Design a protein around this ligand. Structure first.
Ligand code: NAP
Ligand code: 1VM
Length: 157
């Protein structure tokens, strides 16, 4: 299975200045739970943003940099390489990867951040005419998680 994982706001903002625009611990927990024991494919900028591979999953970084060789990280240099990765593969970001992969993935696990943030990077437009809502679950709010959010699982029709 090839899936997208993304958090985007009401206007599809995903990032600002190479970081998340929001602080939402529950989204990180969501991502950790979904991808544990599986594979994440991410662009170079997303990797550098996180700073280190995420433990207990295969971390794959897509880059043109032939000098890229980081401990605990597997490198690929082509989109085509993604299709040779075994198991459940999650497209992890960022904008460039999402733009390249949205027409190719089987499904998407989206956290809709129900606010309007300043962004410099976006998830591409998509329509529910193409995507069946497998599930929609409202995120629970508390003092650590104060922005309304909804977890969608969308499957390509
Ligand atoms: N909200 C979310 O769900 C989420 C998740 C992840 C990231 N983000 C955000 O997304 C933003 C980053 O997105 P971005 O588009 O600027 O960067 P990105 O997608 O993370 O990385 C782009 C880089 O990936 C490499 N790349 C992409 N396609 C390639 C290809 N076909 N062949 C070879 N290399 C390829 C290139 O690296 P080289 O230049 O080294 O060749 C390119 O510069 C940040 O703000 C981050 O916080 C948000
Ligand atoms: C510990 C931890 C740190 C993280 N930092 C990020 C960043 N995303 C963008 C810049 S840094 N993220 C990410 C990365 C990619 C993500 C993605 N593709 N979808 C969703 N919904 N959340 C993400 C969150 C982290 C996730 C975890 C579990």
């Amino acid at each position: 299975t090839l899936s997208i994982l993304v958090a985007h706001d009401l206007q599809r903002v995903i990032g600002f200045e190479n970081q998340l625009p929001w602080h939402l611990p529950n989204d990180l927990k969501h991502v950790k739970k979904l991808s544990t024991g599986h594979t994440l494919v991410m662009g170079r900028k997303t990797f550098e943003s996180i700073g280190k591979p995420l433990p207990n999953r295969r971390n794959v970084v897509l880059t043109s940099d032939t000098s890229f060789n980081v401990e605990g990280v597997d490198v690929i240099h082509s989109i085509e390489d993604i299709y040779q990765l075994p198991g459940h593969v999650f497209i992890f970001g960022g904008q460039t990867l999402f733009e390249e992969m949205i027409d190719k993935v089987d499904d998407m696990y989206i956290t809709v951040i129900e606010g309007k943030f300043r962004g410099d990077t976006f998830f591409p437009p998509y329509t529910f005419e193409d995507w069946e809502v497998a599930s929609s679950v409202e995120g629970k709010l508390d003092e650590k998680n104060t922005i309304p959010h909804t977890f969608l699982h969308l499957i390509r029709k």
